[PDB]
């Protein structure tokens, strides 16, 4: 249905004479398409998908100048926040930034975001109306006032509802063979006895994309969620995802249990049981 673009930035101070570590990553939906890293030899924005390499030198020069401008801004913020919190010179500290936009299935703008964090905690975030900021603590009040006086929201809103949407439409069309696919889970079930009276049933989903899936167990047609074990969704490494859900069943009750799988690649929710 809807689609989204995200850029994720991380900057970490290294005490003494060392430069901060900086890393930037770009995604369309679940698919990564670009990177930058301060500790790489190339010092360029690099492609991470087959459909983006048709972009010319004018794209790769512009993107390289703009990740270096974010990189240079975070070096100054690391030194500033150390002071706002009255912290000592001895430890490393981390800044994280996420921004991007959501575009609907008809190509219209749905919403945009920006979020900042310092040492893993919320610092400041843009409100859903793209007009004002929410501060997390007393040091973030200084930044909120500074960014209001500078009208930072007005520049960022004009990117989020404008340029972010145009380039998302371009990527979705230019990669339509790969970004707009839907692969159903190649489901199966396995039986693993654990004792003379009990066995474990494991219900699997493999090879699916996008990563949004539900797995649930029922017994006699009643939900067993509180007694279910699940792994969190994991990448396969080839553009697909894996998940499983499992329950301990007393020996002889395997026919009373049933696993339900729900995903966009399935015309209706799919049921499995042991046989």
């Amino acid at each position: 249905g809807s689609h989204s673009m995200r850029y994720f930035f991380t900057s970490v101070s290294r005490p003494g004479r060392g430069e901060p570590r900086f890393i930037a990553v770009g995604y369309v939906d679940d698919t990564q398409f670009v990177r930058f890293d301060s500790d790489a030899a190339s010092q360029r924005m690099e492609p991470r998908a087959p459909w983006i390499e048709q972009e010319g030198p004018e794209y790769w020069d512009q993107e390289t100048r703009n990740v270096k401008a974010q990189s240079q801004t975070d070096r100054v913020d690391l030194g500033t926040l150390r002071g706002y919190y009255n912290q000592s010179e001895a430890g490393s500290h981390t800044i994280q930034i996420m921004y991007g936009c959501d575009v609907g299935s008809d190509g219209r703008f749905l919403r945009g975001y920006r979020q900042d964090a310092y040492d893993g905690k919320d610092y400041i975030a843009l409100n859903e109306d793209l007009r004002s900021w929410t501060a997390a603590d007393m040091a973030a009040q200084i930044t909120k006032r500074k960014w209001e006086a500078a009208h930072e929201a007005e520049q960022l809103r004009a990117y989020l509802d404008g340029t972010c949407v145009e380039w998302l439409r371009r990527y979705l069309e230019n990669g339509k063979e790969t970004l707009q696919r839907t692969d159903p889970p190649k489901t199966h079930m396995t039986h693993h006895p654990i004792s003379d009276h009990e066995a474990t049933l494991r219900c699997w989903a493999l090879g699916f994309y996008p990563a949004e899936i539900t797995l649930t167990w029922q017994r006699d047609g009643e939900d067993q969620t509180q007694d279910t074990e699940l792994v969190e969704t994991r990448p396969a490494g080839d553009g697909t995802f894996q998940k499983w859900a499992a329950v301990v069943v007393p020996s002889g009750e395997e026919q009373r249990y049933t696993c339900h799988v729900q995903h966009e690649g399935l015309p209706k929710p799919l049921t499995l049981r042991w046989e």
Partner: antibody, heavy 123, light 110 residues
């Protein structure tokens, strides 16, 4: 890296001071440095005047005690920068230093210094 | 302002402490501090570039520290060669203007 200062040792009251600091073994438009002016006088100790630096564009900071009278100008063709301080009154009598700071040490860690120039304000 | 004691003194081999203190206008300010030695007739020279950080191993006698609005330079093993005027340098947080301390004269008994 060497920093070489030059300019007049005497300026008349209410005239303009114009000093050069010329850079050797380093580039004025370098994106990892900034170029500074500091002065020393027995009634005020060390006083900081301002900086200029380049990233993709030129930027500057000036101290508020002289902000209205001061400007620091780079010259990329000669690889130097100059201090212009207008309306020199007797209170501007000091020894003037140029200095470098980089990005590996923070701001205010003046790594390399020039030979100080003694400036006199008298009729 | 960034005030200092006018002068300190010690016999050869003793430790002497120089401190410089911010005006207590706000608590988080003066976080990055650096220290300068000035011998008579020449430019200041950098001893310490952030609190307790030395440019190189040549400055082993010199030890920087901070507590509240106060920062300090300790000179251990004081030599007759260590008689000089010493200045700290720092800036308020949210500002780009550097300030120097008033200066402390370190004097060696002999």
């Amino acid at each position: 890296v060497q920093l070489q200062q030059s300019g007049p040792g005497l300026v008349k009251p209410s005239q303009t001071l114009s000093l050069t600091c010329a850079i050797s073994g380093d580039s004025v438009s370098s994106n990892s440095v900034a170029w500074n002016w500091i002065r020393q006088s027995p009634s005020r100790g060390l006083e900081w005047l301002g900086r200029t630096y380049y990233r993709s564009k030129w930027y500057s900071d000036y101290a508020v005690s002289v902000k209205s009278r001061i400007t620091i100008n780079p010259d990329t063709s000669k690889n130097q920068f100059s201090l212009q301080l207008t309306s020199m009154t007797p209170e501007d009598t000091a020894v003037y230093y140029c200095a470098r700071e980089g990005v590996t040490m923070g701001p205010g860690a003046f790594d390399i210094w020039g030979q100080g120039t003694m400036v006199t304000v008298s009729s | 302002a960034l005030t200092q004691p006018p002068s300190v003194s010690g016999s050869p081999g003793q430790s002497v402490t120089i401190s410089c203190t911010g005006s207590s206008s706000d608590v988080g300010h003066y976080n990055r501090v650096s220290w300068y030695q000035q011998s008579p007739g020449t430019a200041p020279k950098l001893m310490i570039y952030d609190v307790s950080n030395r440019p190189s191993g040549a400055f082993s006698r010199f030890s920087g520290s901070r507590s509240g609005n106060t920062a300090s330079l300790t000179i251990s093993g004081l030599q007759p060669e260590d008689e000089a005027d010493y200045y700290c340098s720092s800036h308020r947080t949210g500002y780009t203007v550097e300030v120097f301390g008033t200066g402390t004269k370190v004097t060696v008994l002999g």
